Amino acid sequence: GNYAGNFSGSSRDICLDGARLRAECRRGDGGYSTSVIDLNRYLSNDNGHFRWVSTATVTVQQGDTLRDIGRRFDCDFHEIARRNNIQNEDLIYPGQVLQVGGNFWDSARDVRLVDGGKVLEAELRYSGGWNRSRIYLDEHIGNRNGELIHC
């Protein structure tokens, strides 16, 4: 079915201010706002590929594996491991607090909007070089009463 975001139908002059997405957004009342959303909070660089992963923490439960958590959050468990300085990817412990999500900007270059502001593209660092990647921002960026929000 539809994307959940669809900000682009109700927004114009879509711009990037570094990792921050800015637009003139329509408000319920016929007026306009200028709103910004920090895309570095919502997009990860998943070994060379844009992935929607919200900056968050996850507490390990008994029986979890890094693969399962990888699957639950859609991301390379190898990077979860490095980012959280995990000595052995097969050893995690209940109550362990793992940082996940965001942070694409730190390993991106040539970042720009294409397709009338609907698509973000970048060269993203991977284990072996730089990969060109694009992501449809309407998937998860929405306009609620003139504010850009993740949904």
Ligand X SMILES: CC(=O)N[C@@H]1[C@@H](O)[C@H](O[C@@H]2O[C@H](CO)[C@@H](O[C@@H]3O[C@H](CO)[C@@H](O[C@@H]4O[C@H](CO)[C@@H](O)[C@H](O)[C@H]4NC(C)=O)[C@H](O)[C@H]3NC(C)=O)[C@H](O)[C@H]2NC(C)=O)[C@@H](CO)O[C@H]1O
The smaller minimum CB distance to ligand X, of residues 64 and 121, is found at: 64
Q: Which residue has the tokens 């942070």?
A: 103
Tell me the C-alpha to C-alpha distance, in Å, between residue 7 and each of 59, 95, 99. Answer: 32, 38, 28
Interacting positions 36-75 with ligand X (CB under 6 A): 60, 62-67
Q: Of the listed pieces 8-16, 35-43, 92-100, 123-131, which binds ligand X according to CB under 6 A? A: 92-100
Q: Which is nearer to ligand X, 61 or 145 (CB)?
A: 61
Print the SS3 string covering 96-149. Answer: CEEEECCCHHHHEEEEEEEHHHCEEEEEEEECCEEEEEEEEHHHCEEEECCEEE
- Listed ranges 46-54, 91-99, 129-137, 140-148: which one lies at the site for ligand X (CB under 6 A): 91-99
Site residues, ligand X (CB under 6 A)? 60, 62-67, 77, 89-94
